[PDB]
Amino acid sequence: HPAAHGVLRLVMELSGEMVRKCDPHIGLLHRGTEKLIEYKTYLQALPYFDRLDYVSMMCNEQAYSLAVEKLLNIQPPPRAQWIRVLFGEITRLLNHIMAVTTHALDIGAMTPFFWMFEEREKMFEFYERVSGARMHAAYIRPGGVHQDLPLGLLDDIYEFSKNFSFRIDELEEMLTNNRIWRNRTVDIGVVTAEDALNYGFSGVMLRGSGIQWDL
Amino acid sequence: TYKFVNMREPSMDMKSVTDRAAQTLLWTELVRGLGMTLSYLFREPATINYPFEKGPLSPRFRGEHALRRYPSGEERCIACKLCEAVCPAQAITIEAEPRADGSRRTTRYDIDMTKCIYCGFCQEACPVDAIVEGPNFEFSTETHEELLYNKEKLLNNGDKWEAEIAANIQADYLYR
Amino acid sequence: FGREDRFLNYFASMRWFGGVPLISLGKETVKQPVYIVDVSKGIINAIKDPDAKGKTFAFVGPNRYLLFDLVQYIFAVAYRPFLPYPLPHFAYRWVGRLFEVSPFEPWTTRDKVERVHMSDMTLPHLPGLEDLGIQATPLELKAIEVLRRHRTYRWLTSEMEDVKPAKTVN
Amino acid sequence: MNIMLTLLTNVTLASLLVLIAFWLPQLNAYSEKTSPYECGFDPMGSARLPFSMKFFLVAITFLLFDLEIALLLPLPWASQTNNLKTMLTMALFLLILLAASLAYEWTQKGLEWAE
Amino acid sequence: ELVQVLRRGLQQVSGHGGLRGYLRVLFRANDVRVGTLVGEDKYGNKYYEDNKQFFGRHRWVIYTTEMNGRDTFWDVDGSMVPPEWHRWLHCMTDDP
Amino acid sequence: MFMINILSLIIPILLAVAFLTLVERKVLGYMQLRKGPNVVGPYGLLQPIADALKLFTKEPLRPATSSISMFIIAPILALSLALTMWVPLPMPYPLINMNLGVLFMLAMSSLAVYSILWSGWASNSKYALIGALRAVAQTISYEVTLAIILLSVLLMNGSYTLSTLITTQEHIWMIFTSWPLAMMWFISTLAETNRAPFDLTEGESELVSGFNVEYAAGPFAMFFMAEYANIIMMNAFTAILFLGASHDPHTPELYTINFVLKTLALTITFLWIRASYPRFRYDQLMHLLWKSFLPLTLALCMWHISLPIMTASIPPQS
Amino acid sequence: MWFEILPGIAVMAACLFIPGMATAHIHKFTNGGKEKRVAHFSYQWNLMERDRCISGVNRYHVTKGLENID
Amino acid sequence: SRGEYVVAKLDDLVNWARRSSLWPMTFGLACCAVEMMHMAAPRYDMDRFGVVFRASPRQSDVMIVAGTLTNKMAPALRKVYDQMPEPRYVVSMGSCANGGGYYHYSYSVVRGCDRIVPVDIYVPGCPPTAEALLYGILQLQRKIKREKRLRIWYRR
């Protein structure tokens, strides 16, 4: 299904078109990553985390590296830390572009998808320049980062960041004040703060519900 | 610190009320979206003319594998099995024995390119720069068996791509 | 007979041409069809048997049927209205000659008509599936695999046991 | 005559297109190919089961408003009469009664879909 | 001016060696651009560069009509380039 | 000669439909910063031909659970009515000159509704049934609003003859006269032709291709042809009804050129809207027409009944 | 560039020109080089039938005049 | 021969249509699907070549198996492949679809989609770049160009 992201089986009971219950059937992309990680070493298990949330790859790598370094009782050098934070924010930009554009595409709007995916292509070029892999970089590792930046990467990242707020503005021109988008999204999926905290939501769910929390 | 994404209230003066009513009756923001798409229509497309044009790559790119040689023609690999040990997916099968001249050389060196995850650990673990991940990425086949490379295939890839592989390694060997 | 066969599909595809033409109403034809999986298993076991090197086997089914009863059971399982009628042999031969002018795969031919009319021979001297180690599968157990495709929406979900087995001639 | 010929031509062309579509290509059908589509899994129920209609009242109101538009359609010819004042009063009366029907249903919540 | 654009189009038409060359480059490459000849390899492929175009489109190749023993007039692959021109085209270096 | 005229009306319409497919691809591509089809032919001109040949050489299948009779009839009815709607259009001379040429188009559109209903019900699948019911709701709303809007606009005209529409629009444009009704009519034609933001019967995001989910090969191509013919026909009707072109009886080619240009402009506006907006929900579409357009439509109908009387500008009956 | 869309729109316009021009040419051809008579009412139809009768050739578009009355 | 010439021209015409109009099914499983989106993106626009995504399997010619095929998912993949009408083609993209990939020795992963469906093209990589997938699509088109169904039938 185009809206089911490929590997979700949503068994739904409908009275007419009203949804009476949702029974998400997951596991269609269960691979046994944890068992395989048990069978690999610590360096061999890094690409597994690279492939878990394949839209925030360096973020997954950073989480795994932080855990392993905490267990090892070591500290990454300051330049490695700054590179980690920079690429974590670049990864956040990639992920949020993907999220917003795919959400708008399931709604019915596709031009923002194409524009922001051109931007995603440029950020993929940054990933490939540092790591040699366009997405699954395996660049952030326990102890720092694998290799140092090439001698033009910072200038090109500056150019990209310089010309990106205009892309976000063009994205907002099509969605923010559009009455069709407001009708489709306003008062849909309202979740209270107590419900979010009990159900275990984190990040944008909590912040949208109004809880002031950020790791 | 924090900021409120949506907590503004509209003014109730007559001019603002009339402006909102005009926006409701006359589809102002809808026309605005139309204008944005028209602007993008008149902009320049961002499409390359593949296959006559190629996207940029870097000396660090990890593509098809290759086994290199010394400038004298001798194979660099010494059957040390570090790449086989470090391979995350266990895609490398190596078997070795003393050669006729007594060298430590491989008799079997297989890489299952359907099992490889193209992570580049093997070229990091190699102490003699024998196995590398070349710049080639257009090597799709029509049968599964053709993706099960062996030593002859990898040596042929190395001999075919040696110039570009050497150039990439020269460019990027100071960062390693 | 099987999912992709001619036999059951040939008899079940005569819905389109009105009734079912039968020579002598199919009362003079006796047939014992064999299952495709049984035939393939017998071929495999012939390779693995060292004592079948230079031999001749006869693969036949467990039950013999008249052509009329067989076609009637086919249409019963397919849940189609069965309207048989006698067609003289020369008329059927001319009809088969008409259908074999197709450049593509013909629906029927004169030789196909003759083979359908001909009764299956009995060869008790030659070995068979029981000798190669295979128990022959009766038609009543695997007919619904082939003929469920020919049913309509009204009768798709009908079960295997809803149709009484055809009358055998043993 | 001309309109009948045109309708025959259109229907014949469409039927010829269907016939070519169903006979020109190579056919290979089996049970799995012709099974119903439900995103790769077998449907639990049947597509012939009742499908609740949450806008059942709006449909009936649509029937009545279709009658109203049928009444209103002969207005262009009625505007050529000498009794312009009576024609105008009756046309406005019909339109006001239609508006009153809409207002009554809207305030009594007949346009809200069943929950 | 539209006249300038039309004149540039006419120059592009005359830049491929007449109308026939323009048609050949249009039908087998879907591009009618004109660029400086960087060089040509032993297999017949030609390589052109134009720095005025935006990055990615600044270098291109016109493939040969016959490589080794296969007729490649219409069937043109991305693997028909030797490794050195492959590196040059994919921009791992700025030196041809 | 009448058969020749019928062929001259049919075949160019199908050709324009195929090249409308190509044009929509390319326009959406350039608005999405792409190029669209430019490889199959010169500027991708052979792409519709390739698509048509592929579709009609591909295998069409009837689902096991489908009702074959209404499974086949629905595309036939759709394409037949799509081709039939063109016969009373004056460009500048209609093929069939009808005294009541507008009510004919209304009736044929209301009949063209049932093709998607019967195809969805015949397919015997849940997505097809959901698409069919979405069609039911959409037709309800747009049908009532379309009827009243057309009534008012033709009330400014005097009769139900499209040639009389040309005569009325000899001097100025009905868009200048009655632009609010023009806006609401454009939205109603979007809803009628099932174009974005109202493409709810074939909404790919919620349903997998909607009502024609089970249709493949030729029968699918016929639904596509019918939809695009309806798009072009509705845009041509809008151009005739609101953007009147000058007519010269001795050289009628000028009216044909102007009519074609205005029709192409409106079709491009349709494609532009599809590229620019999200998709409605069908309950929100029903509440849009009844709660917003219908009150204004009734008020404007009263206004356009009264205006000729109070200004002594009643059009001639003939 | 955006003018690569023009050939497709040009072909679509060329296709849309054919119906109207063809209808006009056929109307003039089958009516003696004049417009096809519009008979929306019984009076106009009776006029056409009278023209057919007085023409002497069973064609309403064959117009007769003073040379025919005298 | 005249008949041979006619059948050669006819099946060149038919193969051209199928090559130039490819409609992949909207079917992506894992991280390899993001590179399909980037192939659809403006940089490597697949719509140029006549390659257009269709959601329904009834209206698709190519199935691009892009991602890990699990035991819980294999029946759905086979079902949609069967529901695709003929002629139909399969492009397995990435290591997970090709062989096992990173998850070859797993209890819950099918070791290759070629165990389930007949695969025509294998595109290596984890994930293959958008250019690599585009090269695979072009190789599939060149494979279609060699099909001679009418030429086989005439000599049949």
Ligand SMILES: COC1=C(OC)C(=O)C(C/C=C(\C)CC/C=C(/C)CC/C=C(\C)CC/C=C(\C)CC/C=C(\C)CC/C=C(\C)CC/C=C(\C)CC/C=C(\C)CC/C=C(\C)CCC=C(C)C)=C(C)C1=O
């Ligand atoms: C699985 O996860 C996912 C991916 O993967 C991992 C992805 O990648 C993506 C990324 C994809 C997207 C963002 C978009 C993909 C989704 C879509 C729904 C596709 C979007 C595409 C568009 C909106 C535009 C593309 C165009 C489309 C879809 C239209 C399709 C085209 C057709 C159906 C054309 C077929 C019809 C035709 C050809 C018309 C019929 C032909 C004729 C009428 C011609 C006939 C002419 C004659 C008979 C006349 C002949 C006679 C003549 C000439 C003269 C003879 C005269 C005589 C006298 C003899 C997403 C979102 C995703 O979620």
Ligand SMILES: CCCCCCCCCCCCCCCCCC(=O)OC[C@H](COP(=O)([O-])OCC[N+](C)(C)C)OC(=O)CCCCCCCCCCCCCCCCC
């Ligand atoms: C019902 C409609 C009647 C009016 C038709 C008006 C014209 C229709 C124009 C559109 C044609 C669409 C198909 C285009 C061609 C491609 C398909 C094709 O070749 O199909 C042919 C079909 C093909 O058969 P097929 O079923 O194998 O089709 C598969 C075709 N390929 C391989 C191309 C996919 O031919 C036949 O069915 C008959 C072949 C010869 C056998 C004759 C049997 C006898 C009955 C007919 C002959 C007359 C008997 C007279 C005496 C009767 C009394 C004894």
Ligand SMILES: CCCCCCCCCCCCCCCCC[C@@H](O)O[C@H](CO[C@H](O)CCCCCCCCCCCCCCC)COP(=O)(O)OCC[N+](C)(C)C
């Ligand atoms: C839609 C209404 C129905 C129409 C019915 C058919 C009407 C005629 C259809 C028009 C035929 C167009 C043929 C187009 C020729 C192909 C163009 C050319 O480029 O193809 C070359 C040659 O093509 C093939 O060799 C043969 C193609 C068809 C040749 C003629 C076939 C017979 C046509 C005449 C018969 C039509 C009427 C008979 C049927 C009714 C090979 O190039 P290709 O590799 O691909 O391109 C790759 C892209 N690159 C170059 C950028 C990499």
Ligand SMILES: CCCCCCCC/C=C/CCCCCCCC(=O)OC[C@H](COP(=O)(O)OCCN)OC(=O)CCCCCCC/C=C/CCCCCCCC
């Ligand atoms: C003929 C060519 C016309 C071309 C027009 C093209 C316009 C641009 C096309 C892009 C738009 C297409 C996609 C948009 C579809 C949806 C648009 C839409 O939503 O419009 C409805 C819009 C939104 O409503 P809501 O925000 O939901 O508020 C409801 C509160 N309960 O509401 C409307 O009804 C607007 C419709 C236009 C009304 C007309 C303006 C009325 C002004 C009257 C003044 C004239 C009075 C005449 C008397 C004169 C006295 C001297």
Ligand SMILES: CCCCCCCCCCCCCCCCCC(=O)OC[C@H](COP(=O)(O)OCCN)OC(=O)CCCCCCCCCCCCCCCCC
């Ligand atoms: C100037 C005078 C006129 C000159 C031109 C005359 C001919 C014009 C075209 C007429 C229509 C096609 C006529 C028949 C062509 C041959 C088809 C044929 O017999 O194909 C048989 C063969 C089936 O395969 P087979 O070898 O039997 O294997 C059995 C399966 N295991 O192979 C197949 O079935 C292959 C699958 C495709 C078959 C159908 C397509 C054939 C070509 C059609 C081209 C035109 C399409 C028009 C579509 C409608 C309009 C848009």
Ligand SMILES: CN(C)C(=N)NC(=N)N
């Ligand atoms: C497969 N993935 C990750 C998707 N996001 N897919 C999608 N169709 N949107």
Ligand code: SF4
């Ligand atoms: S790139 Fe990684 S997965 Fe591939 S052979 Fe080398 S070590 Fe193994």
Ligand code: SF4
């Ligand atoms: S790491 Fe290098 S030298 Fe050691 S076995 Fe592998 S390729 Fe040979």
Ligand code: SF4
């Ligand atoms: S081959 Fe690699 S990128 Fe593709 S689905 Fe598997 S893990 Fe993801």
